[PDB]
Design a protein around this ligand. Structure first.
Ligand SMILES: Nc1ncnc2c1ncn2[C@@H]1O[C@H](COP(=O)(O)OP(=O)(O)O)[C@@H](O)[C@H]1O
Ligand SMILES: [Mg+2]
Ligand SMILES: [Mg+2]
Length: 390
């Protein structure tokens, strides 16, 4: 892989905020970015050097992208793997379609992570309605109460149903149109962490500090780095687990592995994203090389960057709910960005999305300071200001 050098065209399939932040990282280093995204108002397309407005399976546009670009990546975990494989006929694609196919499918993903030597949650695979019908209630009850999750196309807790007995499992599967699913035992979670790694085609890799993540209603709310409740041993285990998965997968790119720490202290792998991750946004303001720059480096065959964290950090997600302080049925109110910007620790990142909607990710604020407790305190003050907390 002769390295792809500054000045070249780099392709990005998907045009959300992750693709937008990739654009800034690539363009700062002198690359040009072509974004393929069907939406006219794409956050990434708005800043890309070129936006191909097309469906992710459009043959002509895929051909155009691969002809223009020396290397192509994605920011969209649910992208069709066949689109990445089509692109790889004529250009370098990182991560490869085969890797994305494993990570985007909960059944394949749990099997693969287990086969890497990493513990996953107790679960029952439900391949089809016919298969579920043949399972006895005891086999379901062994992982109940639990969560029925669609194997494909879930994000932000969607495609998931709580289930408390075998009958609810069967009704839930019908409610999900009978698609393949995983039934996971609900575990007693003490805290959640994510390991962020980048891996080059050579097998070289870098790892970030462990991020400690808090979710509300299944959506990431904030991230604290380095994880205050993760001992050096656990940090080491979680990092090695992500690297073992990435090595076995032949993964080239940025990989984020989410973990549970249970009340008994055990580490359980939840899922992985074949891309930069919401819980890695802090790297932009806290680390030498951001996760977006690692994606550039991995896909170009350039050396991976240093992951040194120069400042402790907290990321606070900004959902569209913040625009509705008087409730969703009342008019939107522009959030107090002038008061956020008056906070010394605050690094404001807004995605350029036109319409604020509840549940929609509109931005994030990174808080950096000399000490983690100063950053945590600032993020709490900002959360109260925005009515994220009381
Ligand atoms: N087996 C489980 N036990 C307990 N909590 C869980 C389990 N699976 C998921 N959760 C909770 O729900 C959140 C979202 O589930 P996850 O499968 O990660 O959804 P998504 O893929 O949409 O991000 C997790 O971060 C975790 O807090
Ligand atoms: Mg996944
Ligand atoms: Mg998750």
């Amino acid at each position: 892989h002769s390295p792809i050098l500054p000045g070249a065209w780099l392709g990005m399939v998907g045009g959300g905020q992750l693709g937008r932040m990739f654009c800034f990282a690539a363009q700062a280093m002198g690359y040009r970015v072509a974004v393929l995204d069907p939406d006219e108002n794409s956050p990434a397309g708005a800043v890309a050097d070129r936006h191909l407005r097309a469906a992710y399976n459009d043959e002509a546009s895929l051909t155009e992208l691969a002809r223009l670009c020396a290397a192509v990546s994605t920011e969209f975990e649910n992208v069709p793997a066949a689109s990445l494989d089509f692109l790889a006929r004529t250009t370098f694609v990182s991560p490869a379609g085969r890797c994305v196919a494993v990570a985007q499918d909960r059944i394949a993903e749990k099997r693969f992570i287990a086969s890497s030597g990493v513990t996953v949650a107790p679960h029952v695979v439900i391949e089809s309605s016919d298969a579920l019908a043949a399972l006895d209630d005891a086999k379901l009850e062994a992982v109940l109460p639990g969560i029925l999750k669609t194997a494909r196309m879930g994000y932000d807790g969607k495609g998931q149903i709580r289930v408390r007995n075998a009958e609810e499992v069967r009704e839930a599967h019908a409610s999900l149109a009978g698609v393949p699913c995983v039934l996971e035992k609900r575990l007693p979670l003490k805290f959640e962490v994510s390991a962020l790694i980048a891996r080059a085609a050579s097998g070289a890799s870098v790892v970030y500090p462990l991020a400690q993540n808090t979710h509300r209603d299944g959506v990431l709310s904030h991230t604290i780095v380095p994880a205050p409740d993760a001992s050096p041993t656990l940090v080491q285990q979680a990092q090695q687990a992500a690297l073992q998965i990435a090595d076995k997968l032949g993964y080239v790119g940025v990989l984020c592995v989410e973990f549970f720490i249970l009340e008994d202290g055990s580490l359980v792998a939840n899922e992985m994203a074949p891309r930069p991750h919401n819980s890695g946004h802090y790297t932009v303001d806290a680390c030498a090389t951001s996760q977006f720059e690692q994606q550039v480096r991995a896909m170009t065959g350039m050396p991976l960057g240093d992951t040194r964290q120069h400042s402790p950090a907290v990321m606070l997600n900004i959902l569209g709910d913040v625009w509705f302080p008087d409730g969703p049925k009342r008019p939107a109110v522009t959030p107090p960005w002038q008061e956020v910007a008056a906070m010394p620790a605050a690094r404001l990142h807004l995605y350029g999305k036109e319409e604020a909607r509840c549940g929609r990710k509109m931005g994030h604020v990174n808080f950096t300071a000399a000490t983690l407790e100063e950053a945590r305190t600032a993020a709490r003050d900002c959360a109260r200001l925005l009515h994220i907390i009381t």
